[PDB]
Amino acid sequence: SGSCKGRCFELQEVGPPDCRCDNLCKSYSSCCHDFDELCLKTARGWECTKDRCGEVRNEENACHCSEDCLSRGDCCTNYQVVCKGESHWVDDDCEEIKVPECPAGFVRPPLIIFSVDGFRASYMKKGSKVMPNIEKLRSCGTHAPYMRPVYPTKTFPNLYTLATGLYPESHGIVGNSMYDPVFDASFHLRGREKFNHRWWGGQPLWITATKQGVRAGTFFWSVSIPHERRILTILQWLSLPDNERPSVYAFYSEQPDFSGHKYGPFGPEMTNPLREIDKTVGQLMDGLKQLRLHRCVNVIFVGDHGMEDVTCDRTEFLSNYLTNVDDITLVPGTLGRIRAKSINNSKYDPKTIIAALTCKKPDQHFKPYMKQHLPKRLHYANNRRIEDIHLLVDRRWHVARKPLDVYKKCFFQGDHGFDNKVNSMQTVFVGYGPTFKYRTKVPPFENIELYNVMCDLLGLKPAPNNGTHGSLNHLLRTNTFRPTMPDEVSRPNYPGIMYLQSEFDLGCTCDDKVENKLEELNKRLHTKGSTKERHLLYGRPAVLYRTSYDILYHTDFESGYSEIFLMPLWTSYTISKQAEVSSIPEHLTNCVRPDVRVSPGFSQNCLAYKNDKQMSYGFLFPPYLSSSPEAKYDAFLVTNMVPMYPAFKRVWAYFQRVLVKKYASERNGVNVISGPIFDYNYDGLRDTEDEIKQYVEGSSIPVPTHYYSIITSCLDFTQPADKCDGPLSVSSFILPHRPDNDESCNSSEDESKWVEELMKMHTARVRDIEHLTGLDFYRKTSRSYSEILTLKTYLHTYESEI
Numbered sequence: 076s077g078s079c080k081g082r083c084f085e086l087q088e089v090g091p092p093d094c095r096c097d098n099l100c101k102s103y104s105s106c107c108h109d110f111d112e113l114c115l116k117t118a119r120g121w122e123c124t125k126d127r128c129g130e131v132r133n134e135e136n137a138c139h140c141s142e143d144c145l146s147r148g149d150c151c152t153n154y155q156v157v158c159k160g161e162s163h164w165v166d167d168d169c170e171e172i173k174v175p176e177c178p179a180g181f182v183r184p185p186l187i188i189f190s191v192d193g194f195r196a197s198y199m200k201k202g203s204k205v206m207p208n209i210e211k212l213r214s215c216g217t218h219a220p221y222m223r224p225v226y227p228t229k230t231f232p233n234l235y236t237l238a239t240g241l242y243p244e245s246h247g248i249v250g251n252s253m254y255d256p257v258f259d260a261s262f263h264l265r266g267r268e269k270f271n272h273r274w275w276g277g278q279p280l281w282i283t284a285t286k287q288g289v290r291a292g293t294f295f296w297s298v299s300i301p302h303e304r305r306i307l308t309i310l311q312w313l314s315l316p317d318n319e320r321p322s323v324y325a326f327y328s329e330q331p332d333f334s335g336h337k338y339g340p341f342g343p344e345m346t347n348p349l350r351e352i353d354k355t356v357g358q359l360m361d362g363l364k365q366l367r368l369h370r371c372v373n374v375i376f377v378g379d380h381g382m383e384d385v386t387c388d389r390t391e392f393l394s395n396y397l398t399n400v401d402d403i404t405l406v407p408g409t410l411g412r413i414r415a416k417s418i419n420n421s422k423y424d425p426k427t428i429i430a431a432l433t434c435k436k437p438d439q440h441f442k443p444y445m446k447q448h449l450p451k452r453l454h455y456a457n458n459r460r461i462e463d464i465h466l467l468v469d470r471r472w473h474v475a476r477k478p479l480d481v482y483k484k485c486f487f488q489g490d491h492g493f494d495n496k497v498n499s500m501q502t503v504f505v506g507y508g509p510t511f512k513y514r515t516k517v518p519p520f521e522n523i524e525l526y527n528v529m530c531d532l533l534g535l536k537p538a539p540n541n542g543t544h545g546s547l548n549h550l551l552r553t554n555t556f557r558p559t560m561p562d563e564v565s566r567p568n569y570p571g572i573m574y575l576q577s578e579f580d581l582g583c584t585c586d587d588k589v590e591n592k593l594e595e596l597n598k599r600l601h602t603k604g605s606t607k608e609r610h611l612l613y614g615r616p617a618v619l620y621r622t623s624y625d626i627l628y629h630t631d632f633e634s635g636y637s638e639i640f641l642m643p644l645w646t647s648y649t650i651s652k653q654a655e656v657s658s659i660p661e662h663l664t665n666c667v668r669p670d671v672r673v674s675p676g677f678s679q680n681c682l683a684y685k686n687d688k689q690m691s692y693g694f695l696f697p698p699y700l701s702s703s704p705e706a707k708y709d710a711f712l713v714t715n716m717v718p719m720y721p722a723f724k725r726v727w728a729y730f731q732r733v734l735v736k737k738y739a740s741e742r743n744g745v746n747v748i749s750g751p752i753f754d755y756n757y758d759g760l761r762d763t764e765d766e767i768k769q770y771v772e773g774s775s776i777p778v779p780t781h782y783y784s785i786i787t788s789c790l791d792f793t794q795p796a797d798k799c800d801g802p803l804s805v806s807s808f809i810l811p812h813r814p815d816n817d818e819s820c821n822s823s824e825d826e827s828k829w830v831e832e833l834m835k836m837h838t839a840r841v842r843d844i845e846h847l848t849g850l851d852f853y854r855k856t857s858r859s860y861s862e863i864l865t866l867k868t869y870l871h872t873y874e875s876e877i
């Protein structure tokens with residue numbers, strides 16, 4: 076029942092039930108009666124015209140062109156241009172901002188986040204003729220060719236990842252629609268439930284700012300408040316006295332996502348929304364220039380996801396695959412999440428659901444997965460709000476439950492939400508200001524990294540998050556943060572020859588007993604690690620947890636062998652361009668040899684594989700790439716051996732026999748690090764031994780859930796991988812270790828038609844492998860630590876050129 080007299084867009088929300096005057100009161104139905112009148116003035120528009128100059132202050136107007144307006148901080152943004160012969164910010168040549176140029180009483184440069192919904196990366200080039208302000212920010216500041224959103228590429232997961240540096244599985248907003256079985260409640264876009272704190276995990280920037288005594292603009296805007304009013308409110312706040320003025324502000328545009336849904340990413344109707352966005356960027360920058368803040372403020376221009384072409388006719392229906400579609404609830408669209416419609420119903424069975432959706436039609440436009448089998452690069456499993464069954468939907472398609480759902484809910488021509496590697500889902504980043512570099516292009520990066528940077532730009536300490544602090548230092552002219560290498564926790568043992576053959580009772584056999592001062596002196600040095608400079612190019616990986624392990628040297632490879640897990644944690648080898656592929660000689664098919672540097676009790680044994688009818692075994696260093704007939708015997712040590720389902724042996728064998736040699740050919744040598752991963756609780760983090768759910772039958776040999784490889788070479792491919800003088804190039808994958816090849820609909824064909832495709836799907840960052848293994852790679856290089864962190868966050872996507 077109170078008033079907004081003197082409180083328009085107040086910075087601290089008042090306590091109920093007293094009427095509010097902040098930028099969120101409309102959204103709550105709690106604004107004061109006089110809010111529209113005082114706080115949402117519209118009279119005469121947003122632009123000073125040639126006959127408003129010098130006017131007599133009329134308080135009814137949206138903005139002002141009177142003489143006192145500069146003092147009141149409430150001029151129209153073009154006031155100086157129309158009235159005082161000033162130029163627009165965009166018409167001025169851009170001058171490097173080598174230091175902040177701020178008015179007295181600014182403790183730090185303000186940060187302004189300008190986030191735009193559905194702003195696809197290619198808009199920067201394709202719409203460049205109609206966005207001269209955005210294009211000036213882009214070419215004068217720092218920009219990436221594009222920014223990778225998180226999965227699912229929806230609005231709320233992505234804007235909250237931008238604010239927290241966390242994966243949605245961690246922050247808890249895992250879609251635009253959710254059901255939380257613990258709270259027994261649902262989250263929807265439309266509604267009031269979305270405003271309930273318990274949905275929102277982690278610690279977003281504005282709460283981080285406040286706990287550390289940095290004042291934050293009320294970030295969020297009720298939808299009806301026009302963009303021009305949003306801008307003038309931000310400029311008004313920038314004129315508050317120093318003890319009241321916030322240090323960070325956010326502006327959000329519903330465009331071009333809104334129009335993109337109706338017309339498609341490139342519909343001719345899309346030119347106008349892009350013009351309007353630019354017009355708003357113009358207004359801000361002219362307003363900052365009026366305030367003399369245009370060389371003081373850091374501006375971030377940032378999208379949450381792109382937009383793809385999607386129409387009604389490209390819908391796949393679960394009714395065409397399942398009889399009894401009514402026993403399920405589907406969260407539909409560009410992804411699918413399936414649960415049981417009722418919990419008292421216990422004839423529902425997920426195993427049978429997946430089977431009925433697996434490779435059922437020649438042209439099938441979605442693939443079912445249990446969430447824990449999804450590619451690890453999506454990080455989309457460790458949350459009770461993520462349904463066990465998940466449908467990865469092809470770009471350009473929708474999934475729905477029944478046809479009735481589509482024609483009664485064509486209407487739309489664009490959508491988003493797909494796999495975050497998809498070109499059309501990529502978005503933008505431009506940073507402009509004293510803290511950002513001048514005319515700098517940086518490589519593409521993931522939006523999870525920005526929370527640390529925004530914290531850096533504000534002199535704040537980030538809450539723990541999924542960014543890699545320091546990986547984006549190359550954006551910044553000056554950085555608060557200088558990262559340091561984590562300390563090694565366990566140091567290795569270097570065993571010598573300690574055991575006699577006959578002490579081993581492993582049920583292993585080898586046709587080996589056919590073999591001299593020449594090459595026994597040589598193999599002695601091979602076991603001391605003579606060729607180790609060749610095979611271990613960037614130093615040994617550090618182990619960052621408490622464990623017992625051995626470094627084992629060989630002619631062709633080096634490994635860190637775990638006495639706890641009975642297998643290597645990592646194996647490292649170099650394959651030059653000139654190296655040859657040989658076969659496994661017939662007599663050595665089944666050869667496994669005891670390793671006399673490791674005790675029987677810390678060794679695997681061949682019997683358990685004999686007795687485990689579902690489980691076989693493979694090697695980490697591939698015997699196919701042994702450098703000589705003699706070196707080949709090393710490849711058959713029991714300590715190079717790991718458990719593999721026969722179905723996965725097809726995959727692995729093809730990688731080792733064919734793909735490794737191909738990459739060495741194409742890249743001029745490669746260094747390969749391979750190993751097992753254990754993630755039974757699907758949290759993207761290394762399991763301890765008491766978390767292992769599967770052992771090779773009647774033995775303490777744990778079964779990995781995944782196998783990784785990290786393949787490194789020289790970015791300058793004219794240099795060989797073992798002789799690189801410069802930056803490195805990397806690709807990695809995390810392959811799921813599965814007893815069938817149901818994932819690949821073409822598996823019954825030759826490996827040359829499906830294996831590489833599978834590997835591409837399971838591409839990973841070296842950083843993903845680090846979390847999953849507790850190792851730290853690239854410890855000894857000539858490169859700067861910041862450059863290495865960037866390499867570790869790199870993802871090889873196998874999409875074409877944007």
Ligand SMILES: *[C@@H]1O[C@H](CO)[C@@H](O[C@@H]2O[C@H](CO)[C@@H](O[C@@H]3O[C@H](CO[C@H]4O[C@H](CO[C@H]5O[C@H](CO)[C@@H](O)[C@H](O)[C@@H]5O)[C@@H](O)[C@H](O[C@H]5O[C@H](CO)[C@@H](O)[C@H](O)[C@@H]5O[C@H]5O[C@H](CO)[C@@H](O)[C@H](O)[C@@H]5O)[C@@H]4O)[C@@H](O)[C@H](O[C@H]4O[C@H](CO)[C@@H](O)[C@H](O)[C@@H]4O[C@H]4O[C@H](CO)[C@@H](O)[C@H](O)[C@@H]4O)[C@@H]3O)[C@H](O)[C@H]2NC(C)=O)[C@H](O)[C@H]1NC(C)=O
Nearest residue numbers: 244245246247275276277457458459539540541758759846
């Ligand atoms: C990406 O980055 C993130 C963030 O860094 C990584 O996620 C973190 O990972 C940690 C290790 O897994 C995990 O540690 C947990 O913490 C449990 C308690 O956590 C609660 O408190 C958190 C802190 O909030 C406060 O933050 C600051 C301090 O920093 C304070 O000043 C404030 O006061 C804040 O309140 C909080 O973040 C967390 O939030 C979760 O839950 C909320 C409400 O339910 C949700 O809103 C929110 O979304 C979070 O939910 C996520 O996390 C949970 C798992 O925590 C997950 O299930 C969800 O899916 C979702 O993803 C909490 O409120 C603590 O219980 C754990 O301790 C157990 O394990 C240790 C092992 O050392 C034992 O020693 C210990 O005794 C204990 O075991 C006992 O309980 C066990 C299980 O119940 C049981 O088995 C056993 O028998 C024992 O009795 C552990 O320390 C962080 O919580 C987590 N943080 C976040 C934000 O998720 C993530 O790993 C990264 N991803 C990758 C791939 O790298």
Ligand SMILES: O=c1nc2n(c3ccccc13)Cc1ccccc1/C2=C\c1ccc(Br)cc1
Nearest residue numbers: 190231234235237238280294295296298325327
């Ligand atoms: O005015 C709005 N601000 C926002 N959203 C709106 C959605 C509809 C109408 C208005 C709004 C969606 C959103 C979701 C989750 C987290 C932040 C935001 C958000 C801005 C933002 C601020 C700071 C950062 Br950092 C990132 C995003």
Ligand SMILES: [Ca+2]
Nearest residue numbers: 754760761762
């Ligand atoms: Ca785990």
Ligand SMILES: [K+]
Nearest residue numbers: 684687690691
């Ligand atoms: K077997």
Ligand code: NA
Nearest residue numbers: 816817819822
């Ligand atoms: Na198959």
Ligand SMILES: [Zn+2]
Nearest residue numbers: 193332336491
């Ligand atoms: Zn949208």
